[PDB]
Amino acid sequence: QNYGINLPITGSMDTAYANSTQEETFLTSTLCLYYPTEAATEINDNSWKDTLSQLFLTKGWPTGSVYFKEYTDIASFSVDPQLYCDYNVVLMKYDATLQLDMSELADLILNEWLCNPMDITLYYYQQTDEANKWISMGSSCTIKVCPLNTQTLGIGCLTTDTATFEEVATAEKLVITDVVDGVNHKLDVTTATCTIRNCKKLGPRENVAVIQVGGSDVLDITADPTTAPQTERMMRINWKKWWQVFYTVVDYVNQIIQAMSKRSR
Amino acid sequence: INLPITGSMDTAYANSTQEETFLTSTLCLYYPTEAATEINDNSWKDTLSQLFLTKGWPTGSVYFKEYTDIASFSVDPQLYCDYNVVLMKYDATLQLDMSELADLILNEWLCNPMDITLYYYQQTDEANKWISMGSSCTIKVCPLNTQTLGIGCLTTDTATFEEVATAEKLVITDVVDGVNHKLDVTTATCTIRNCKKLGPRENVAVIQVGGSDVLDITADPTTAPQTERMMRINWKKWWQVFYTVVDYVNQIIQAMSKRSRSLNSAAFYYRI
Amino acid sequence: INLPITGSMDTAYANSTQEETFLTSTLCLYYPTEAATEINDNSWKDTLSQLFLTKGWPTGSVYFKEYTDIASFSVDPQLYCDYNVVLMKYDATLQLDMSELADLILNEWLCNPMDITLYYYQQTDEANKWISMGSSCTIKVCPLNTQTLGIGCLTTDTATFEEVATAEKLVITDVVDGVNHKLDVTTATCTIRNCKKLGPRENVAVIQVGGSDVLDITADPTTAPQTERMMRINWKKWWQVFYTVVDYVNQIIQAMSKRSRSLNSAAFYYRI
Amino acid sequence: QNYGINLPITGSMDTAYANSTQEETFLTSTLCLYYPTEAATEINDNSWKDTLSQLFLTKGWPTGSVYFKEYTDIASFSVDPQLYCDYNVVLMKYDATLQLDMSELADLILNEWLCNPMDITLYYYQQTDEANKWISMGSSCTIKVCPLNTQTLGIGCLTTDTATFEEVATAEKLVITDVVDGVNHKLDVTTATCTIRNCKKLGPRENVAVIQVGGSDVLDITADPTTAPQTERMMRINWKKWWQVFYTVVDYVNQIIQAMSKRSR
Amino acid sequence: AQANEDIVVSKTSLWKEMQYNRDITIRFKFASSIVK
Amino acid sequence: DYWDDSQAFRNMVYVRSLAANLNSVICTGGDYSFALPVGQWPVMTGGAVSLHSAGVTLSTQFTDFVSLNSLRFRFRLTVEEPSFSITRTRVSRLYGLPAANPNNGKEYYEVAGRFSLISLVPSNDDYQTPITNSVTVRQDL
Ligand SMILES: *[C@@H]1O[C@H](CO)[C@@H](O)[C@H](O)[C@H]1NC(C)=O
Ligand SMILES: *[C@@H]1O[C@H](CO)[C@@H](O)[C@H](O)[C@H]1NC(C)=O
Ligand SMILES: *[C@@H]1O[C@H](CO)[C@@H](O)[C@H](O)[C@H]1NC(C)=O
Ligand SMILES: *[C@@H]1O[C@H](CO)[C@@H](O)[C@H](O)[C@H]1NC(C)=O
Ligand SMILES: [Ca+2]
Ligand SMILES: [Ca+2]
Ligand SMILES: [Ca+2]
Ligand SMILES: [Ca+2]
Ligand SMILES: [Ca+2]
Ligand SMILES: [Ca+2]
Ligand SMILES: [Ca+2]
Ligand SMILES: [Ca+2]
Ligand SMILES: [Ca+2]
Ligand SMILES: [Ca+2]
Ligand SMILES: [Ca+2]
Ligand SMILES: [Ca+2]
């Protein structure tokens, strides 16, 4: 029961595999699907949630373990996405005009961020490593950055004239900013409408799973443009209706929950 | 970790982790509006940062977060830092409120939601409580009998319910454990959560700026303890308060200790 | 009994006497009229009885006794039960009054009467005090020298005396021990008695419903203790107070212990 | 010095008979007579207390040890008797219309009761053993009781209609009620004027002594109609005056206080 | 406990004592007879 | 008398441990215009009375369509301030409710409640007790 420490664990290769924890995790866990308003609109029914719960019942998930939480738009969900469940699925519609927004959403929910506050007006910040970014949430973020030199003066910008600053975000609801690591920056942000936090990336969040309902794999989680990965819980589907998508999620939930693992934190 | 730890009493005392925990940690103050009002200065935050710089905390590590009032802070607090200090003004007309705030932030709560319409709940042990947050929470309860009817109250006539709160922003409620209660809440304006009190939160530090020690964290009347991170000051200004905090910040953070449970920006964990 | 007792440390820890003392004992609350008023219900006593029933206390063992004022209760408090709880509000203007009440009910006193006109009395030890009860007591005292004359007063002029009470329903008077005092008391409305403080009464439990700890049971200004059956709550309502007392009655009774001396209904023994 | 504990005390039979405690128990103890107003009326003197005390002086009781406490009538004294002295004597007149009153008074003072409170409106009580009784005091008590059956219904009475109840007391200042042991009784009482208490009779009170001034022995202390005892501190006298009675009490105070023993409690 | 519970306090082979605890909305109405 | 299509009233013929928590309401009478042939038109207007919860029992609702083994809620009356008076007449200021227009142009009187009972139901949840009717009573009438 020692908390706050990390010790070695030993084992062997002779001991035998235990029984399937499936059919018991389903009974002592919670599942939460995040669907878009388009789905309910196309379906046009008021008992589809009870229907899907009755179907999940055949898979073992009991009645009040499955939850459905609507979200009108990818951006409205990006604005402070609060995933508080023991298993989260997120159905995400593809739109070539939203690639970066719904990749920042992936980089936000799939991964686990240690976020500290920021006071732009007093301090001038820098990034320390390739995991410390600046993530900004709100209704309309308009971020501008001035890199500075050793002598606390700007580079291609003037520390007073805000119009000289360089723009990286304009009218965005969720931004994830990566800048050069080792130079102090000065920021101009719409603090009234957006709060920005200095956030270090950690080991992933194995509790959530994204499902791109439409187009090809585009999600570039990794900022460094060399990896371009595709994790086990970044899935894809092709769609012409939504009842088929939900029936597929149901019929292959076990695969999804084998792809997802409960959090360490 | 289920495993054990071992050690020895012959090993040597390592150097001071102070002057490094400062660097690799963040500090955050929670001051009332009254402070900045009495001060009437626009650079006091940078001033205090430059002062902390002597104590070792670097420039971009200290933070200040205003809160207009104790109750407006009690409404869904969000402590997201590595070392939190709170400065709390004393008022006998707010004693239970600024004790509930203490009970909420000093401790670490595991909260589930509550559906009053469809369900009737009960407290299992002396660590389960009901914490309710919002702009105006009016909470009434009718205890129930073995056959799901009322005891000194009518299960429908809400006037016959028993009033435990009247237009309160943060309410912490403990009822007789072992019986089912039917609740009435201003659900439009307040959310109520069934929360269990786990081990304490060693990341925060309350500082009562005025009157004698009154905070009774433990809802039981017998203990009435005084933890190490529940400090008191006597005051006539606020610049002296802040200079005292800056001068004795080492003792404060030696009385505090970083968390072990998880990374979380709210004042309570959620487990559905 | 004068004989000695003997025992061991190998002998085993017997079962919990709780859940049988509850059946074979009585519990009695002393609540203010303010609580009945704020509640405005005519069945809360039966409610609390049915609640206690889950904690084990049977129906006919729980009792409630309304007292309108701390002073009205201080006028000859009559505790006749096996476990007494008292809910005591906090008022700075009544600090010494609700401290004397504690000093009187928490501790056990052995009282002789006093005949002011015929005799002149003194105190011998640091526990021989003069406790005066009534509806309006106004006490004055003249110390006397070795040769039965006055010191700063005259034996005849009741205006030269030194006033220590001004229309107080209960007073506990400690004067210098070793000198004889001539008293003047409103005997028509008050009775004064020379009492000796014995060991404590472990049958009663005071609960200060409001502000900070103020009760100084001991008259000497050096101890300022805080015993175990002396609690403190912070409150905004009364149903929360009662639910708390109920949920934590077992801690209260574990903090209390049935008496040893004798059966008595008054707060003090009489031996003439 | 162990309190609250009961331990075995040893002894022998060759030890010698220690000296007399009389003539010292008098000096270190107080005596208190309880005489009726009739006696002072017949006397018609304002110095008879001082006279009796000066007489007591010869028997060894000093001035400030003897006390006299007047009562107007047997029932007015029955209302909350406060016998607080080291030795108590109670002179008691005989009247056939008050036999039960002056038996209840004796039963109350001669014996040491352990009294717990009662709340009629809420609770329905029962007597467990042959020593549990209900003693009610006050200026005018009027008590009615309904036995109840296994299912909380009445027996020759209706739980609601108070008139159906059975009247055991009718405007009495002191009543000692014993009912059948084992059946829950619902009560109605004039709580505005009387207080009722569930009292268990413990061992006797050896500190008091009743002296019946007139008629034959009548006091049936024991509720059980089988014992009909007569203790050592239950005295009797024949009178045609009161000065003779007081002279007799004085002249034989030593035997009285040999029949009386200081309390245990 | 739910506001619309249904519990079993005894169950033999064919019969069973079922407990019910439920909320209801009694919407009633008078009706008058007028004979002239 | 009250009845529902719920599981509690499906085969209810036996009931014990019966009890209920009902809230009190206020029944107010309306305005009935006595349509005289000629002359003035007196109107019986007013009347208020508060219905308070009371004991509960069983009953049977008989009708020309359905027969229901139903739950009988009682109500007692406490006279209220609004009195009923026949206008243009020598009668007024008498408490009670009039039996001409009690509803006061309302569709119904609503009151919420809770009930708790224990009934005998066959273990198999498929049994059905006759509800509907086809009545031919009072053929002499
Ligand atoms: C483990 O699985 C096997 C195969 O189904 C089963 O027989 C066994 O009972 C399981 N273990 C336990 C402890 O039930
Ligand atoms: C700890 O402090 C001592 C005394 O200043 C110093 O000599 C030593 O090097 C320090 N430890 C390390 C690891 O530097
Ligand atoms: C004492 O407690 C133990 C543990 O609960 C129990 O098994 C035992 O029966 C108890 N004995 C008595 C005499 O109460
Ligand atoms: C006890 O009585 C005898 C005879 O009167 C006497 O001699 C003796 O001194 C007495 N005891 C004491 C302790 O005085
Ligand atoms: Ca974006
Ligand atoms: Ca530029
Ligand atoms: Ca970067
Ligand atoms: Ca509050
Ligand atoms: Ca109530
Ligand atoms: Ca509790
Ligand atoms: Ca006083
Ligand atoms: Ca003087
Ligand atoms: Ca003294
Ligand atoms: Ca009598
Ligand atoms: Ca009868
Ligand atoms: Ca008896």
Side-chain angles (χ1 to χ4, degrees), chain C residues 217-245:
Chain C
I217 294 156
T218 64
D220 63 333
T222 44
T223 55
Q226 197 180 356
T227 345
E228 288 78 37
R229 68 216 191 285
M230 269 222 304
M231 299 155 227
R232 180 168 53 77
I233 295 164
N234 294 331
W235 75 298
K236 213 177 291 304
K237 299 292 186 179
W238 282 101
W239 276 107
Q240 197 71 85
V241 173
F242 283 114
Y243 293 170
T244 298
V245 170

Coordinates of all heavy atoms in Angstrom, one line a residue, chain C residues 217-245:
Chain C
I217 N -12.8 26.0 32.7 CA -13.4 25.3 33.8 C -12.7 25.6 35.1 O -13.4 26.0 36.1 CB -13.4 23.8 33.6 CG1 -14.3 23.4 32.4 CG2 -13.8 23.0 34.8 CD1 -13.8 22.0 31.7
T218 N -11.4 25.6 35.1 CA -10.6 25.8 36.3 C -10.5 27.3 36.6 O -10.2 28.1 35.7 CB -9.2 25.1 36.2 OG1 -8.5 25.8 35.2 CG2 -9.4 23.7 35.9
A219 N -10.7 27.7 37.8 CA -10.7 29.1 38.2 C -9.3 29.7 38.1 O -9.1 30.9 37.8 CB -11.3 29.3 39.6
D220 N -8.3 28.9 38.4 CA -6.9 29.4 38.4 C -6.5 29.9 36.9 O -6.8 29.2 36.0 CB -5.9 28.4 38.9 CG -5.9 27.1 38.0 OD1 -6.9 26.8 37.3 OD2 -4.8 26.5 38.0
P221 N -5.9 31.0 36.8 CA -5.5 31.5 35.4 C -4.2 30.9 35.0 O -3.3 31.6 34.5 CB -5.4 33.0 35.6 CG -4.9 33.2 36.9 CD -5.4 32.0 37.8
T222 N -4.0 29.6 35.1 CA -2.8 28.9 34.6 C -3.1 27.7 33.7 O -2.2 27.3 32.9 CB -1.8 28.5 35.7 OG1 -2.6 27.9 36.8 CG2 -1.1 29.7 36.2
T223 N -4.2 27.0 33.9 CA -4.4 25.7 33.2 C -5.1 25.9 31.9 O -4.5 25.6 30.8 CB -5.3 24.8 34.1 OG1 -6.5 25.4 34.5 CG2 -4.5 24.4 35.4
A224 N -6.2 26.5 31.9 CA -7.0 26.7 30.7 C -7.2 25.4 29.9 O -6.9 25.3 28.7 CB -6.4 27.8 29.8
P225 N -7.8 24.4 30.6 CA -7.8 23.1 30.0 C -8.8 22.9 28.9 O -9.6 23.9 28.6 CB -8.1 22.2 31.2 CG -9.0 23.0 32.0 CD -8.5 24.4 31.8
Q226 N -8.9 21.7 28.3 CA -10.0 21.4 27.4 C -10.2 19.9 27.6 O -9.4 19.1 27.1 CB -9.7 21.7 26.0 CG -10.9 21.7 25.1 CD -10.6 22.1 23.6 OE1 -9.5 22.4 23.3 NE2 -11.7 22.0 22.8
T227 N -11.2 19.5 28.3 CA -11.4 18.1 28.7 C -12.0 17.3 27.4 O -12.1 17.9 26.3 CB -12.3 18.0 29.9 OG1 -12.4 19.2 30.5 CG2 -11.8 16.9 30.9
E228 N -12.4 16.1 27.6 CA -12.8 15.2 26.5 C -14.3 15.4 26.2 O -14.7 15.3 25.1 CB -12.5 13.8 26.8 CG -11.0 13.4 26.7 CD -10.2 13.8 27.9 OE1 -10.7 13.7 29.1 OE2 -9.0 14.3 27.8
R229 N -15.1 15.5 27.3 CA -16.6 15.8 27.1 C -16.9 17.3 27.0 O -17.9 17.8 27.6 CB -17.3 15.1 28.2 CG -17.1 15.7 29.6 CD -17.1 14.6 30.7 NE -17.2 15.3 32.0 CZ -16.2 15.9 32.6 NH1 -15.0 16.0 32.0 NH2 -16.3 16.4 33.8
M230 N -16.2 17.9 26.1 CA -16.3 19.4 25.9 C -16.0 19.6 24.4 O -14.8 19.7 24.1 CB -15.4 20.2 26.8 CG -16.0 20.6 28.1 SD -15.6 22.3 28.5 CE -13.8 22.2 28.5
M231 N -17.0 19.7 23.6 CA -16.9 19.7 22.2 C -17.2 21.1 21.6 O -17.7 22.0 22.3 CB -17.8 18.7 21.5 CG -17.5 17.2 22.0 SD -19.0 16.2 21.8 CE -18.9 15.4 23.4
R232 N -16.9 21.2 20.3 CA -17.2 22.5 19.6 C -17.6 22.2 18.2 O -17.0 21.4 17.5 CB -15.9 23.4 19.6 CG -16.1 24.7 18.9 CD -15.0 25.6 19.1 NE -13.7 25.0 18.8 CZ -13.2 24.9 17.6 NH1 -13.8 25.2 16.5 NH2 -12.0 24.3 17.5
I233 N -18.7 22.8 17.8 CA -19.3 22.7 16.4 C -19.3 24.1 15.8 O -19.3 25.1 16.6 CB -20.7 22.0 16.5 CG1 -20.6 20.6 16.9 CG2 -21.4 22.0 15.1 CD1 -22.0 20.0 17.4
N234 N -19.3 24.1 14.5 CA -19.6 25.3 13.8 C -20.9 25.1 13.0 O -21.0 24.1 12.4 CB -18.4 25.7 12.8 CG -17.2 26.1 13.6 OD1 -17.2 26.6 14.7 ND2 -16.0 25.9 12.9
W235 N -21.8 26.1 13.1 CA -23.2 25.8 12.7 C -23.7 27.0 11.9 O -23.3 28.1 12.1 CB -24.0 25.6 14.0 CG -24.3 26.9 14.7 CD1 -23.4 27.7 15.3 CD2 -25.6 27.5 14.9 NE1 -24.0 28.8 15.8 CE2 -25.4 28.7 15.6 CE3 -26.9 27.1 14.6 CZ2 -26.4 29.5 16.0 CZ3 -27.9 28.0 15.0 CH2 -27.7 29.1 15.7
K236 N -24.7 26.6 11.1 CA -25.7 27.6 10.5 C -27.1 27.2 10.7 O -28.0 28.0 10.7 CB -25.4 27.9 9.0 CG -25.7 29.3 8.6 CD -25.3 29.5 7.1 CE -23.8 29.5 6.8 NZ -23.1 30.5 7.6
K237 N -27.4 25.9 10.9 CA -28.7 25.3 11.2 C -28.6 24.5 12.4 O -27.6 24.4 13.0 CB -29.2 24.5 10.0 CG -29.4 25.4 8.7 CD -30.5 26.4 8.8 CE -30.8 27.1 7.5 NZ -31.9 28.1 7.6
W238 N -29.7 23.8 12.8 CA -29.8 22.9 13.9 C -30.1 21.5 13.5 O -29.7 20.6 14.3 CB -31.0 23.4 14.8 CG -30.6 24.6 15.7 CD1 -30.9 25.9 15.5 CD2 -29.8 24.5 16.9 NE1 -30.4 26.7 16.5 CE2 -29.7 25.9 17.4 CE3 -29.2 23.5 17.6 CZ2 -29.0 26.2 18.5 CZ3 -28.5 23.9 18.8 CH2 -28.4 25.2 19.2
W239 N -30.8 21.2 12.4 CA -30.9 19.8 12.0 C -29.6 19.2 11.7 O -29.4 18.0 11.9 CB -31.9 19.7 10.8 CG -33.3 19.7 11.1 CD1 -34.2 20.8 11.0 CD2 -34.0 18.6 11.7 NE1 -35.4 20.4 11.4 CE2 -35.4 19.1 11.9 CE3 -33.7 17.4 12.1 CZ2 -36.4 18.3 12.4 CZ3 -34.7 16.5 12.6 CH2 -36.0 17.0 12.8
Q240 N -28.7 19.9 11.1 CA -27.3 19.4 10.9 C -26.6 19.1 12.2 O -26.0 18.1 12.4 CB -26.5 20.4 10.1 CG -25.2 19.9 9.5 CD -25.5 19.0 8.3 OE1 -25.7 19.4 7.2 NE2 -25.6 17.7 8.6
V241 N -26.8 20.0 13.2 CA -26.3 19.7 14.6 C -26.8 18.4 15.1 O -26.1 17.6 15.7 CB -26.5 20.9 15.5 CG1 -26.1 20.6 16.9 CG2 -25.8 22.2 15.0
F242 N -28.1 18.2 15.0 CA -28.7 17.0 15.6 C -28.3 15.7 14.9 O -28.0 14.7 15.5 CB -30.2 17.2 15.7 CG -30.7 18.1 16.7 CD1 -31.4 19.3 16.4 CD2 -30.6 17.7 18.1 CE1 -31.8 20.1 17.4 CE2 -31.1 18.6 19.1 CZ -31.7 19.8 18.7
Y243 N -28.4 15.8 13.5 CA -27.9 14.7 12.7 C -26.4 14.4 13.1 O -26.0 13.2 13.1 CB -28.0 15.0 11.2 CG -29.4 15.1 10.7 CD1 -29.6 15.6 9.4 CD2 -30.5 14.7 11.4 CE1 -30.9 15.7 8.9 CE2 -31.8 14.8 10.9 CZ -32.0 15.3 9.6 OH -33.2 15.4 9.1
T244 N -25.6 15.4 13.4 CA -24.2 15.1 13.7 C -24.1 14.5 15.1 O -23.4 13.5 15.2 CB -23.5 16.5 13.7 OG1 -23.5 17.1 12.4 CG2 -22.0 16.3 14.2
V245 N -24.8 15.0 16.1 CA -24.8 14.4 17.4 C -25.3 12.9 17.3 O -24.8 12.1 18.0 CB -25.7 15.2 18.3 CG1 -26.0 14.5 19.6 CG2 -25.1 16.6 18.7

